[PDB]
Design a protein around this motif. Structure first.
Motif, PDB file in Angstrom:
ATOM      1  N   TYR C  11      43.004   7.312 -63.200  1.00 52.49           N
ATOM      2  CA  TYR C  11      42.199   7.683 -62.437  1.00 52.49           C
ATOM      3  C   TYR C  11      41.636   6.574 -61.648  1.00 52.49           C
ATOM      4  O   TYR C  11      41.386   5.539 -62.419  1.00 52.49           O
ATOM      5  N   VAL C  12      41.571   6.921 -60.264  1.00 52.47           N
ATOM      6  CA  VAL C  12      41.088   5.592 -59.480  1.00 52.47           C
ATOM      7  C   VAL C  12      39.960   6.109 -58.531  1.00 52.47           C
ATOM      8  O   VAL C  12      40.196   7.430 -57.937  1.00 52.47           O
ATOM      9  N   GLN C  13      38.937   5.551 -58.525  1.00 51.88           N
ATOM     10  CA  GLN C  13      37.710   6.017 -57.674  1.00 51.88           C
ATOM     11  C   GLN C  13      37.082   4.945 -56.782  1.00 51.88           C
ATOM     12  O   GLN C  13      36.823   4.036 -57.471  1.00 51.88           O
ATOM     13  N   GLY C  14      36.804   5.165 -55.609  1.00 50.08           N
ATOM     14  CA  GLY C  14      36.061   4.000 -54.898  1.00 50.08           C
ATOM     15  C   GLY C  14      36.060   4.455 -53.339  1.00 50.08           C
ATOM     16  O   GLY C  14      36.799   5.385 -52.953  1.00 50.08           O
ATOM     17  N   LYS C  15      35.427   3.641 -52.688  1.00 54.29           N
ATOM     18  CA  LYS C  15      35.040   4.025 -51.304  1.00 54.29           C
ATOM     19  C   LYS C  15      36.429   3.472 -50.452  1.00 54.29           C
ATOM     20  O   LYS C  15      36.956   2.591 -50.691  1.00 54.29           O
ATOM     21  N   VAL C  17      39.555   4.419 -50.870  1.00 55.12           N
ATOM     22  CA  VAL C  17      40.738   4.206 -51.805  1.00 55.12           C
ATOM     23  C   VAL C  17      41.840   4.819 -51.063  1.00 55.12           C
ATOM     24  O   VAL C  17      42.997   4.698 -51.434  1.00 55.12           O
ATOM     25  N   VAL C 221      27.247   6.251 -49.087  1.00 60.85           N
ATOM     26  CA  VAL C 221      27.744   5.924 -50.391  1.00 60.85           C
ATOM     27  C   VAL C 221      26.831   4.913 -51.258  1.00 60.85           C
ATOM     28  O   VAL C 221      26.720   3.936 -50.696  1.00 60.85           O
ATOM     29  N   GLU C 226      28.324   7.064 -56.664  1.00 56.91           N
ATOM     30  CA  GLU C 226      29.562   6.713 -57.373  1.00 56.91           C
ATOM     31  C   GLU C 226      29.469   7.094 -58.938  1.00 56.91           C
ATOM     32  O   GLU C 226      30.615   7.653 -59.402  1.00 56.91           O
ATOM     33  N   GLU C 230      32.162  10.267 -60.562  1.00 56.27           N
ATOM     34  CA  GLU C 230      32.766   9.983 -61.874  1.00 56.27           C
ATOM     35  C   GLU C 230      32.143  11.060 -62.810  1.00 56.27           C
ATOM     36  O   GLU C 230      33.093  11.561 -63.427  1.00 56.27           O
TER      37      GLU C 230
END
Ligand SMILES: [Zn+2]
Ligand SMILES: [Zn+2]
Ligand SMILES: [Zn+2]
Ligand SMILES: [Zn+2]
Ligand SMILES: [Zn+2]
Ligand SMILES: [Zn+2]
Ligand SMILES: [Zn+2]
Ligand SMILES: [Zn+2]
Ligand SMILES: [Zn+2]
Ligand SMILES: [Zn+2]
Lengths: 361, 361, 361, 361, 361
Positions: C11-15, C17, C221, C226, C230
């Motif tokens: 699982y990859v989460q970010g601005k 990405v 954001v 964030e 999640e």
């Protein structure tokens, strides 16, 4: 890592202490130079000179031009040279006090700092600063900071609210530097002394800030006002210099990237908004953020972009502020790893959070 | 009433900071005088001189006679005059540091204070003192206090325990001055800054004191030791000078009225007992008093008359101590309204309370 | 009884990405198929293809018909076969992501799931579903779930509120399964890992949910957004699949027994009401229930039958919903022993409780 | 910064679950290779093969040499090639499980991990490691981790205590990475999911650890043992991999710089001491540190240098450990800014703190 | 589901209340039958008859054989028939009271239950039971339960400790039935009345149990003894019958599967161990379990297998106990889903947990 703590040599605060000035300078010298602008000479300047004369202390009266430039410092330093004064007394607001510190460094003179409002935490510091470029240190922190609460009780309420705003940034910023392992303006990691001072600063302001604001509105000196003047001057001063700066003052500096009516706001008014931006960049619940917004509103301080004269500002304008705030060397890097874009987003978020609060009361 | 806060200009603490001495003196001068006694010259004196030479800083090596007398100061000041040194560096324990401060006042020199143990809170102060007669102020607090924790980790554990004892008196004494509306050594009522510093001092010691004591026994530097060295030096120093003295140090001074083996104890060891006496003069429950006794015992500090070499002392001997402690001008009057007889009774009570605790474990 | 926990592999989460997509697929393959509907191809589809081309990764662009049917899956799988793509990338909302998972199962392909809103907790799951008939498991949970918060900050606020609604059911449902000794969708009793995840999900939403909702309204954001993305995706996903479902999703499924405008609401909006029904079937005080109602209202979510387009619905209509919700095999039986009539009563009770709250503010 | 969470696809834990192995592999394949060493083949290896035969699943029995070397992996991979097995089943301790993971990567095979003790948190991870050189990632986390508590209840109590030690490092290390803004082994900052998992891990161990230890001594399976096996395997595994490593495992790795009897201790036993060192490098009170020491002692785990076979070790020997622990690329830098000398001091401090505790009971 | 609560018609407790027996039977009848064994006739039987004679109430004196068999009931019922008595008075312990209840059912007579010890919670119940086969209900709960605390203060302390043991199972068992949605002996789910009664039972015992035990040792009646007699009789009675049974009494019943000295223990002594087994089957921390173990020890109750005469018992013997405890129809299924093997493991765990506690004090 080494911890470093710096401080002015002596801090004296009390009602009518301006009248004992000749007393504190006794075993120091008999010749001084007094620096103040036109308005302040009437407010306190003449009272000081008259107090020095009674004690046989000479005093060259200097009228500050109103601009803290190298030329003005050179001009004033010459006068002091000729008068061969060994003590520099600066009275008034920010630009005057900074100029006086610069003057004292040229002359290697004993310096007395006499604020006429408790509006910023610049008085006790060894540092200074249309676009912000960098911080510069003087050779020393001031020898004597003399704070007369009777004078401050007569200064505009807006100036006390501004000082509370600047002091409310202290714990927010210092705590973020302590948590991140960053460095303070003083050069090392924060001491436990600075952490204690900074945290007590916030407590004092939440406890007495509104009562101190009402005291000034009625022009009276009370225990609450004495507590807040110390918080605004000694606690906030040591806390920021030896506790650390972070995002809030970086945002304040970033505003210099813009031209406009925003620059008529005080340093404190800009820091209030800058503080909300730092809180938006951190992990806080809605209730924690609103605790600050509530206080700012009760002190008539700005909490929205509209309040800081940037109504409907464009993304491009905010981005300029963010780029300046994240410039290499700014203090935001002492506690955060953010980009200019993250900061621009946080500025709009803080505005939205404040509006959401307002649209609830 | 005016509130006053004073402080050394700069405090630097860290492992091996003694090696950057030439660095901190750069923009100050290139000629110094270094003062230390025979033992300390081996411990740190030569290391300092060698660090100054690398930076092209001259250094007149002075061997302190071991007695802080006017003659010794005059003798050392002459040497400095001739060498025309502008910086005085004092290294070592109490008497050496005081002498160095006196020397710096004669010369109007920049003074660096380098303690080799964190055993008392004299380092950062602007004051000094076989029978005690009075406190005298120097013209200034020290310009630079440089505390190397690697050096202190190698000093005897007994000296760290002594410094903890002296620092444990800080909040007890300052709190009593704050509550009574008394004045501090600095001349006015205590600031909120000093109250915050003093109270944080006690918290830091109860939290990390034993771990710091074990660190020194193993001769290692840890976060716990760094915290306690700051408490013992910067927090205790500011706390007592700008927070206020009361009964505990008055009792310490009162012991000078006696001759004997008690005078081989350290300042801190005597203050530990003096602190128990102050607690016996106040309104505390048995549990509150035992909280301190427990800590003193875990640091091998004295808690009974027998421990301070006054086993089976007579009422008349204790009365001499009490009379000296309550002399006109002593600090006990800043927080209490007691007679010499009340104080004599409190000395025996503290002894009885400690014995009662001991006869429980 | 055995405890079982399942999860997507990564699982990859970010601005922003989405821009590193070619980076995460490097050591996997150089040929892919990208699935999205017409609107999403403009929102993110082309950006993804362009990012894959830069990295020399082929990409067959597939336009999803909008219906997750066997035929559409067969149609898309053929295309992938011919292109001989080894990676399936699904971008968009629910139906698209499910279709992409079905496609990846046919091909035994590596699957990347890229949601364009944080509106449901379907992304990380290995399961799918006009009347609901049953849950079906895919052969695996997704290999990579890539969540770009910049994209979600630009999606409609209503979709974030919907995702918060779906995530607010997680702890309510999982806690009821844990207490009853029931089984999760994963097949066994819940692990401590799922209980921790589910409970933290609720805490995160009460703490940051409104701030995240305001962030999206301003299209920015923030740390709050964030955190909630999640919670809405990873915590809610693992929490429901491996923590357990109960009455809330059973009620959501029961609505399919009805025809009407209710089916224009989102999954989350229906789950919000379903959650209130579960709370009405449990033993909670009025204050505990109102804590949820208050939050739903501040997010503009539905709390009454009228809000879900069932104003003045008849007992017979509600009974159909209740019968479907209590069908053999529904999840309500994992935590409750109730009849369709008990459930019908709870639906009207929840409506009455919400109205009572509203008629108080 | 992006947050990343990775996990094995499926985790199954329960009494006698080894008997359903054929059940979980049904829709996967009918041919496998089973890897175990001589002792483990007797403990569980034959039971597994027999369970696979009943389900018509072929199984090539491989006897692990006992060394996880490239040659052994190549040797085993060949056998699997020839048998054309699509599933790799590794049974046993650390070296066997790592080898099995390496084998599965060569073959791109489905991998089942079956630990026979809950002694480390290596089972669910995608990573591996006489002197430590670096961490290396496998292509995936394991497909199925199958944990049979009946088997673990029969493994030596020392091995459960070791697993508790390794799991007790999870929250200490992850919390330090979260606070410092560092990165996890998974590549990004920690998710809220990992923080929740890591913190719950510590809570579970303080609550049930001793009861689980007594359960194993009596060779019985209880709720307490089921809770601790999950903590030792699933919570500790996800917590360290996706939550972050710091000083504790860096110290464990540093021990490889030494030769001697210390290398007969288990991974967990070394991590217990490593954890005390990390606590000595942080700011904790004596009571917080003793809370861990007390637990270690009740589980018969090592707390002093003497306990880890380094009695009277020299400063030079400890310095080698410290240098290795602070090597470029070690995990200590993800949470601390320390030198090898600071770490050497912390190792001796931890020993002194434990001795001080022991010399109190 | 329906909630059901049942209760004896009247409960009277007080010092010397046995003397008002004729008073409570006034408006009921003038002819009775009194049942007691040889010892009890001396303890209270004659006192009762004499009190009935004073009030002109006839009384057929029956000597209970000591065995609660159908024949004995038939024998006693005949006597009552002939005497044509309308009131049955049973005095003494368990077997006598049960017999008296059976007798009253045959005759449809008013029944008075007079316990001579507060050793079990059988007195107020409508139910009864060498191997246990099942529970059977009488037609009613007793009409009058008369508890004389002066009599109980003179009964052996061991019998009060036994009653406390039986009553300490009440909240443990009822709470587990309430949490699981199980049914009580009374036939439905528990009422709030029973939950309140059961929970207050435990509180009363932890508060007054030891003082009541000391009261009995000194043969005196105190408020503490009055509180515990009510807990042991009325609260424990209603709590178990209308609150629910679970694992603890199932284990007590399971012991009948064994022959031996264990059957000389009292019902309460066996329930104490059974209660520890239930706690081992639940999720409790070590501290929660020890809270009960500590109390059992202070009352000289059994906590280990050795204490219940099963020292070094074999797994096969314990398995017989477990199989009987998990028989179809046992109460353990009202709160747990466990196998005989899980229960056998829990029996050994409880023993190990108690030993671990003992090997700590
Ligand atoms: Zn400022
Ligand atoms: Zn203007
Ligand atoms: Zn002192
Ligand atoms: Zn002597
Ligand atoms: Zn959902
Ligand atoms: Zn429609
Ligand atoms: Zn490990
Ligand atoms: Zn060896
Ligand atoms: Zn019973
Ligand atoms: Zn016998």
């Amino acid at each position: 890592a080494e911890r470093v703590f710096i401080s002015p040599a002596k801090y004296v605060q009390g009602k009518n202490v301006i009248t004992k000035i000749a007393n504190y300078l006794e075993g120091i010298g008999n010749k001084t130079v007094v620096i103040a602008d036109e308005i302040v000479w009437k407010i306190a300047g003449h009272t000081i000179v008259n107090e020095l004369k009674k004690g046989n202390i000479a005093a060259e009266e200097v009228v500050f031009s109103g601009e803290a430039s190298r030329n003005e410092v050179e001009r004033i330093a010459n006068i002091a040279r000729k008068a061969e004064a060994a003590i520099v007394i600066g009275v008034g607001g920010g630009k005057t006090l900074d100029t006086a510190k610069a003057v004292a460094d040229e002359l290697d003179a004993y310096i007395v700092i006499v604020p006429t409002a408790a509006s910023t935490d610049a008085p006790t510091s060894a540092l200074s600063v249309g676009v912000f470029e960098s911080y510069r240190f003087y050779k020393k922190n001031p020898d004597l900071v003399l704070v007369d609460t009777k004078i401050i009780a007569n200064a505009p309420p807006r100036l006390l609210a501004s000082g509370i705003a600047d002091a409310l940034a202290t714990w927010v910023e210092a705590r973020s530097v302590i948590k991140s392992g960053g460095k303070t303006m003083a050069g090392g990691i924060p001491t436990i002394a600075a952490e204690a001072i900074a945290e007590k600063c916030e407590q004092t302001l939440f406890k007495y800030g509104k009562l101190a604001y009402e005291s000034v509105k009625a022009k009276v000196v009370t225990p609450a006002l004495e507590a807040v003047v110390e918080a605004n001057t000694l606690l906030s001063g040591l806390g920021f210099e030896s506790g650390g700066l972070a995002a809030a003052h970086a945002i304040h500096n970033g505003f210099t990237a813009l031209e406009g009516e925003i620059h008529h706001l005080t340093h404190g008014e800009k820091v209030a908004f800058g503080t909300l931006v730092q809180l938006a960049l951190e992990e806080h619940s809605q209730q924690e953020i609103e605790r600050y917004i509530e206080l700012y509103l009760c002190l008539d301080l700005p909490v929205t972009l509209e309040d800081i004269k940037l109504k409907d500002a464009s993304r491009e304008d905010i981005l300029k502020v963010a780029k300046a705030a994240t410039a290499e060397g700014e203090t935001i890097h002492n506690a955060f790893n953010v980009t200019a874009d993250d900061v621009a987003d946080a500025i709009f978020a803080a505005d939205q959070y404040a509006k959401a609060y307002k649209e609830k009361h």
